[PDB]
Amino acid sequence: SVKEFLAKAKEDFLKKWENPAQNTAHLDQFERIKTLGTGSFGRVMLVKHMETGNHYAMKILDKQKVVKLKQIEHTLNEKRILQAVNFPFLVKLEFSFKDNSNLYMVMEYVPGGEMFSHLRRIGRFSEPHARFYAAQIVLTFEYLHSLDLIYRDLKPENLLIDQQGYIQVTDFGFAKRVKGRTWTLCGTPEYLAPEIILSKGYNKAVDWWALGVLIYEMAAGYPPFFADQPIQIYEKIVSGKVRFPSHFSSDLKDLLRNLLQVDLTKRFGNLKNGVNDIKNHKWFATTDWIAIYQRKVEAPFIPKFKGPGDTSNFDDYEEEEIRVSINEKCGKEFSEF
């Protein structure tokens, strides 16, 4: 049973959650190659592990910047959660460590680039293409939510395409283990459920709403709620009036009305029958959930691979030195990292 698979999956998770791995490498073990992306409290770099010659993506977080942005507890969540999970569509954390200045998370390198890049370039995905990605997210959230985790930042910028054309969810910066309700305003404006905007307690249902936004964005090529400033996006979301492209199939529209549902008693994912309302929807009738999980389905798109350590599927970013202070910064705040 999936119930039973997930039961056992939780026992595995809980062991790692209660006794987290810590300090499993050192910066000098890696050669830094190139910046793959950036964010407010740091960057992600392509690196090579000298001892194996394996290439990895190393997220580097400046501890002082994390403190300023009030992301201490969120960063601790991120690392504690990522070291404990195990699912085909979650990027693996290979190593983590810290030094005087920074925290480091060394993860598997996903060479095909961001969904975002391919989506913007190509314009939109066919319904079958979008459905293939959406299925992987459906299974992933089923997994995460069974572990009492809320993910809270679904978007194409953090969905990387692997060499087999399947999705890797990266980034867990807003992921949280919580039974019941939570309150933090976090996420990306276009993907926020109305509950978050309206500053209510929310739960894992915000992830199912975010799935609706993702599917719409993939199939249409633009999100259901856009504007030039975030405040204008929020006004649109809380209306929740959604218009669909004339090219959207009738099933796709019906799935999205039930995901992008302001009414929690009515939002798919949130009902008595849980994820199965989604999995059994007509739009997914052709999806073989076991073959998706097994990675037996032929991907609609396979990214270009010129070689190992190739970054051609990634944009170029300004390179900045990794400076390590001779004085320890913020030791107490990140003691458990």
């Binding site: 407010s40 975002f116 930042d153 933090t184 305003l185 976090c186 996420g187 633009y222 218009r243």
Partner: peptide, 20 residues
């Protein structure tokens, strides 16, 4: 067209996370 309006908007690039 909605596509034209999107492409002309300021939010076709990578979108930053927000937090309170």
């Amino acid at each position: 067209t909605t596509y034209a309006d999107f492409i002309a908007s300021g939010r076709t690039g990578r979108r930053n996370a927000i937090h309170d």
